Amino acid sequence: DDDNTEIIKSFKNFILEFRLDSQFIYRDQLRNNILVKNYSLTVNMEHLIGYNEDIYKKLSDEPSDIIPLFETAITQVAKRISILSLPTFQLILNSNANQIPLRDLDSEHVSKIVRLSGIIISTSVLSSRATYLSIMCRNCRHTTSITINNFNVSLPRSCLSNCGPDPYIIIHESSKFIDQQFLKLQEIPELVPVGEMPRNLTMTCDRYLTNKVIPGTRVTIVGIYSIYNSGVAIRTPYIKILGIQSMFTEEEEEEFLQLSRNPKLYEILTNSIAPSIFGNEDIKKAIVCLLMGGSKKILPDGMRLRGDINVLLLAKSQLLKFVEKVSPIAVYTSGKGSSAAGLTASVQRREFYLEGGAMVLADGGVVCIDEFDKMRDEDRVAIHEAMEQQTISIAKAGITTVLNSRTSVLAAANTTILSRFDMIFIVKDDHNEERDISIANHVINIHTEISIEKMKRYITYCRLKCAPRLSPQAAEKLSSNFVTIRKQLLINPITIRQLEAIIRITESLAKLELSPIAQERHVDEAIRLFQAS
Amino acid sequence: SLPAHLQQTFSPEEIQFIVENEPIKIFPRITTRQTRWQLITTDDKALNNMVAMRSTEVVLWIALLLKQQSKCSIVAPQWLTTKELDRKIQYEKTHPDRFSELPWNWLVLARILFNKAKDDFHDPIHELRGKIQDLREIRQIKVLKGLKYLNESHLQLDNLSLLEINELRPFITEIMDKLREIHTASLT
Amino acid sequence: MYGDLGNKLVLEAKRTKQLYARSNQDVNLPMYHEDIIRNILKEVSNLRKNTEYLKEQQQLGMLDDKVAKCQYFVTLLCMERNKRCLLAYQRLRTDILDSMAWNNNDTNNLSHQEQEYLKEYCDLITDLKSGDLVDIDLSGSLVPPSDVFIDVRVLKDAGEIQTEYGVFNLIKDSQFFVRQSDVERLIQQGYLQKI
Amino acid sequence: DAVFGDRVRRFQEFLDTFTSYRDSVRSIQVYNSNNAANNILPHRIIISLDDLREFDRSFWSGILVEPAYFIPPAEKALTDLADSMDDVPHPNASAVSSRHPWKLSFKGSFGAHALSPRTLTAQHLNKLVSVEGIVTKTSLVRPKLIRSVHYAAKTGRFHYRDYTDATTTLTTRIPTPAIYPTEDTEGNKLTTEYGYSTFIDHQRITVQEMPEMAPAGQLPRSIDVILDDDLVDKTKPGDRVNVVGVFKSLGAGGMNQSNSNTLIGFKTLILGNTVYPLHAARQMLTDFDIRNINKLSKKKDIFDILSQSLAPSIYGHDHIKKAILLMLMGGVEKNLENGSHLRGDINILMVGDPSTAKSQLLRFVLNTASLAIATTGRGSSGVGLTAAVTTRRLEAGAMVLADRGVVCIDEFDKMTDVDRVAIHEVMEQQTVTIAKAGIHTTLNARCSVIAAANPVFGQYDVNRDPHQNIALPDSLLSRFDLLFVVTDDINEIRDRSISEHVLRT
Amino acid sequence: ELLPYPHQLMKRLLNRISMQSQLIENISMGSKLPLLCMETELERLKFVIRSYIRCRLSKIDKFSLYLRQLNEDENSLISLTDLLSKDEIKYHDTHSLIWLKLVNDSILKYMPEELQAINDTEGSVNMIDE
Amino acid sequence: MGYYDIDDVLADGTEFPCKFQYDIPGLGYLENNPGRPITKNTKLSLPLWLARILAIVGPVPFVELLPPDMFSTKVMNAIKTDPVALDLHSINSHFFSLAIKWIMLFSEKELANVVSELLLQRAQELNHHASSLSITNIATSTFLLKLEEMEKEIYKKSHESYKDTKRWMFK
Amino acid sequence: MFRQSSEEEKKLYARLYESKLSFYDLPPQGEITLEQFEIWAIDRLKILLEIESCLSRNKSIKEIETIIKPQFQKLLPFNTESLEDRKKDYYSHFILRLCFCRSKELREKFVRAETFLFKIRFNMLTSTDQTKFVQSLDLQFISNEEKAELSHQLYQTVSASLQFQLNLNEEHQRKQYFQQEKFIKLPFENVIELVGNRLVFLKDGYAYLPQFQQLNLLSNEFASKLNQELIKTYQYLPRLNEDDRLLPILNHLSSGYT
Ligand SMILES: Nc1ncnc2c1ncn2[C@@H]1O[C@H](COP(=O)(O)OP(=O)(O)NP(=O)(O)O)[C@@H](O)[C@H]1O
Ligand SMILES: [Mg+2]
Ligand SMILES: [Zn+2]
């Protein structure tokens, strides 16, 4: 009976007295946590060992029994430093003891503190556990209560106030609960013995340790290793977790603004794109416009005006990879697609279902296709809606839905399908031996202007800050040019769907300067670059 | 002209400078009584007329200057002892709104003497460092209750230390000013 | 409308204030917006032309009691709100320059009127610093003196240098035991650290 | 126990002070009492939670933080108010002991307790909350026993008893065995009086967070809701909805002896107190709207004003705009006395050159009609466009879903012949009928069809017959009321006008 | 507000500083510790005056037009020379001319004659702070 | 409320709804058409530095001010139920400046009583997050995204004050 | 810790109705109209006529409360902040003093009806208002030791009453309530109606009364003081005879009771 009080007294005196130099680090942490309504304390093992090794010995021998005593000691201190009501505080631990590989845990480790690491592969939804709980006695209608704590219980049968063999029921109307979550940990990929699939464990956490990690992340864990019921005299193992480890500034945009006022910025960005590829000036210019895009608009009668750009390329393999690297969001694929969804989408089967290809998945970003001629039959017809409407719509086998396809397409190949693109160009080659020798020397080196990340961040900044508008001079210029080309063709086609493409290119050119208005300077280069032919 | 962080307030360095002008009691280990000090902001007679192991009173900055070397020893103030600090904590607990009557420089002087003069105390220093903390924590509770009475007119405070006031100054004055602006705007 | 350019210009004042306040060591106030200011002044000139034309129509008798009064009055407000924006922006950059003048007593971002303004204010500071009250170094340190003697380590090879107290030889990564009142200026210049 | 009485008194003071709730009680009562002498309105009232705050903060926070202790006495007081007001005499046997009190509902300013299924957390248990999401599942409606009445054969005395279950009450009571008593305390054999007993309706649903809010492709989260009495069947799957109710827990949670080592948690629910839809179509007119509509109708040329106000961002094509307006108004549907039916709804087709705003104009109808479904001609099959079999259950297609609405079909020329012929019934008989293994049924499909297509040769050829340019059978073209041909004829002033227009746009 | 300058105190203090400096030099040219105390005391004294004068000049920057208007009012109950020291008077006067020249040429040269005043009270916003 | 104050300069440029009481020639540029008159009972959205005068100068003054959406009844009920949870930053970036200007303009009594309580109740949690110093980021960062531009300055000058004191003590 | 720091007639009636009921203790002041005098008197008279009619029909307190409570909002409002309602109530009572002081039969009828109305309105109060009203009237509880010594007798006396009047059917609930209940000691002659029904415990000429009972003492004090005030009112009726314009109204008011 007295041992429960001496242990609590000891951990209480630990928190009140541990100085390193001149700051009572655990008193300060416990106070600073309460002010932001965080009811927990993060103790470090090495400090506990330094203070008194006997306390650590008791904790190391019987953790399931002693962790609750230390938690209630924290509550008793929390009241003195803040009251002249609070829940029970959660204890959290940090440690540097030797990691055990997950594959070596065995019967020698049951009910011991264990430190390990791995990859999280799954996460459950949250669930409710009881801490303070109220009871009603069915016969006499007397009432009482119980206090649960979550360490390795059932309803009692000692009836009170004969009173019967099993008379107790729960008053959910006057009881207290906490959150609980389950996780799965898989052993590290670079540890697994050859020819075997990795082993994994299941584990539990509650209160502030919940909702702290997501699938696919590598983590380190401190927790009690134990067993639970679910052959003869045999039980399943698991872990109880006690700790886990895993927009612009002003000085950034000042650089982007200095770039914006450079008189040769257009040349600089074109030079910075796939610099190993010789020649092909207009290809690089078109990729800049594809990355920057026009401006989206919405009208009073609800009609909606597209912002994206689309380009086709007829050496060429390198540019799509470069675009994939520089773009803020990107998807890469070959014409057959990643599944029976193809490029656009399809219905599959047993009940029917639907899945989207690599037009739906790239929504909001850029998508690049590596051989557009290898497009499947259904995609040949479906890409018309995907490009003109920025949607895909299906009404088959009782499915009736519409999918978003808001993206800019880059494509390459080697017909009427060319009409869907804003610009089309044919890649050109040159055969200087020095270029191949330089490439070969670099290949041997690995076997034995603006940088990508800065350019990607700049493109992001420009897309977020500016969406410019045509000046009246540009309108007169464009309309005069439009009727001039149609008249020239008539005396010897251009159509509105291409005028509205020239406008988007013009806006994308003005966007580099961050000029809020587009000007004749941009219109001239737009029509100059329009020579796809 | 003046820095932005000194427009309305004193930094802790200036607070230390202000506290350093107070007198303190010392035991010198040398006799100066029959060159002479010839100071211009203080008395000069006390330093010129020292006798070894005879108690005397000087400004704190000179006292710390001497204690840097062998030549001097500093007597702790009488409030800075275990018995008195026990009584002040009991006063703090007994009267849940009043502040106990500690001197206006208690925090600053404690954290100067514990660094420069750890050897000259009679009590064990590891207990004083605990009781000072207890006092500061209780006073912080009482402060947090008081910030629910910021108003358009005024407030009264008692026995709150200089450093404790200076810690809170830019919050109290700002919120109080805006309540005043909102109220007077409705009168006009 | 006539206030849009002002509402755009003042955002640069707010931006440069926050950039300046974030890092006291990194003061380089940005390019003066000559083009926006010129556009605002051109707008004011347009409004002046409109008021002058309206005064001609008033002298012609074109319903001048009500019509000229209301149109003139409304135009006057549009001019005043532009004056306020321009003065606010220029006053902010002036405060920054005044702050630098006290420590210093490069030029390309300042407008030429500002370039002569800074020189004028430097002359004023040295006039105050000279003459009577010279005994206290008005451009010196504002942090109270804590210690007489300190230990300082040698960060940059400036070689042999002269100072009012004497001569120093700044042998890279040597260490001095010396009075602070001497080396305060060299610490501010950045040849030394306190360790 | 005594506190219950004082809470009833305090809510009575509220009901006397804010008089707009008395008018609500009385108006429902007089309406129900009128038509009973010849539909009936529910015994339910919605209170503004703001009025209660301004009346008494101590009662407001009590309702909002301890609903199990404040909602029952408040609801009791409402019933006393409605009962003391005058009511029809000589009630029938079933009316005398209905066990049917009035019920409350809430609106306005939930503050911190306005939530979503992802963020509902164990801290919020037993609080009154508001959640938002999409309905995903609904149970069948079931009746539930709450009271039964019995007649004792010898003594001539009518007896009764009441039943409870954990989802029927906010406060907690000993559960009841659902047994009917056969014999009296005094040994008399009993009989059960159905029709005097009381049963109520019950339905469970599930609500999930909206897909627009799902993070990182992670699994979405959801809650189950309990509905009863009046709230049953007011929703269907796919509805966006906002639900108000008490968040509560249930059951023994494995502490009644189980193999789980109590790792499993307790069960939880929301008890539906009020339900509101979300607009994501319909509007309700104010008096001023009726006045403006009637006044505008007396202009000399209302048809021109209205037609030109459709898609003003599209230049030209006056006649197609007028045709679309007449389609949106429609004819009048006739049913003759012998059961014979005559069609009322207008179908329109337009075929033409590339880029001539066909798809752009077709897109406008989808955003001004009250019910509209859109599809591309090659992305849809005959069965998917009309109806399909599943498991036997029969599942509706797009033309069955838009019943009294409009269906838009783009790229109509790409639809296969096998798909087109499924439409021949729907555009005249306005029904769908299936005769397949284990099924025979007829379904209703009354919509108007509007569609766009490309001519056979890629551009319209005036030097060949219209049948050569338009490859569709005569029996299908006959079903479209208006067939429009449109082309991109090159002309200077036309080009200039259109280009200047799009640039101004 | 800007409080009135202590004219007499400053004269006496600055004279005392000069005399103490010469005394320190004479004793230095003639135990170490007394010199230590004297030197650091003079540093402590000079710091306070430096801070005080910098604060007053900062107040004069912010209320320049207000002080000028207070001086121009012939009916004022206090003269500007009562409030400020001679050095402060020089700073106020010449700094006002420097600032005035900068805005007068840059902005106000372009404004119509009704809006060319810098210290206008009658406009839709008061141009004088206090 | 100083002349050269940037925040005051910037807050006066917010637009408020207005209605005219006279037809006037040539002022159609306010309606973005310089070639036309303004006509009586037309409604427009004008910046406060202009509407504050046209509502006063005469008699009947030229413009009448309509009750703006940022002082609507829904906002007042949101304020009075839970002031600490409220996202004032989304309602309007400069709320406590415009509130005082509107109070001066119409001499409102009840609005002043609502706004005083709102400020006093939010100052509490602002001090809590100011006092809490590391020896956490998410818990603080969620509330500090709902502060006005007015409140951010008070938070910054409080946090720096506590931090400087803490640094000096433990040194 | 931090720290900061005729109209008289209206204040009089605010004070008189802070308790929500009054013994009608004090002389009214200022003026009202003669139409108001007649109408206010008739309104209170209608309520008291219905109270006497129901009592002559031998109806219970609950039935009378169901009958009379809807009439307050029309004739004589209660639980109200309105100065007009408060003046109407106060003045109407004082007017009917002058109408019903005239004879022993009229005094008895008026005292009976007004005391029953007092009982009704007291039942409408919250327990806090009842406590404050009783405390405002300057109205001996026994010691805990005396309660312990007499606990068996007191519990035997009140146990049935706790079950029937407070619905405490469980003996456990009765014991808990009795442990929390206070008792009053006074001479048995003061509560003789409870004595005749054996609802109080008697010892040495003193009756022991639980706190949840004893409202009959309050209403009896109201009735007794009203009777004495009516006797006084009767003695100075010759001063009422100086304004003739009031006597027809008072004759009309009394005629409905004769
Ligand atoms: N007045 C107009 N006349 C013609 N086209 C216009 C007009 N105004 C805009 N457009 C544009 O014309 C383009 C093509 O319109 P759209 O409706 O897709 O043509 P379409 O008839 O569907 N051509 P298609 O998809 O090849 O069958 C869009 O980008 C419209 O914005
Ligand atoms: Mg199209
Ligand atoms: Zn029992």
Residue numbers in the entry:
A (entry chain 5): 21 to 104, 131 to 198, 205 to 213, 235 to 303, 320 to 335, 348 to 415, 421 to 455, 460 to 524, ...
B (entry chain D): 2 to 35, 48 to 201
C (entry chain C): 1 to 105, 119 to 208
D (entry chain 3): 18 to 55, 90 to 331, 338 to 448, 455 to 568
E (entry chain F): 75 to 104, 122 to 221
F (entry chain E): 1 to 58, 68 to 144, 158 to 193
G (entry chain A): 1 to 5, 44 to 177, 181 to 299
Lines from the paper:
Pol α-primase is a constitutive heterotetramer composed of a dimeric primase (PRIM1 and PRIM2 in H. sapiens [human], Pri1 and Pri2 in budding yeast) and a dimeric DNA polymerase (POLA1 and POLA2 in human, Pol1 and Pol12 in budding yeast). During eukaryotic DNA replication, Pol α-primase generates primers at replication origins to start leading-strand synthesis and every few hundred nucleotides during discontinuous lagging-strand replication. Pol α-primase binds directly to the leading edge of the CMG (CDC45-MCM-GINS) replicative helicase via a complex interaction network. The non-catalytic PRIM2/Pri2 subunit forms two interfaces with CMG that are critical for in vitro DNA replication and yeast cell growth. These interactions position the primase catalytic subunit PRIM1/Pri1 directly above the exit channel for lagging-strand template single-stranded DNA (ssDNA), revealing why priming occurs efficiently only on the lagging-strand template and elucidating a mechanism for Pol α-primase to overcome competition from RPA to initiate primer synthesis.
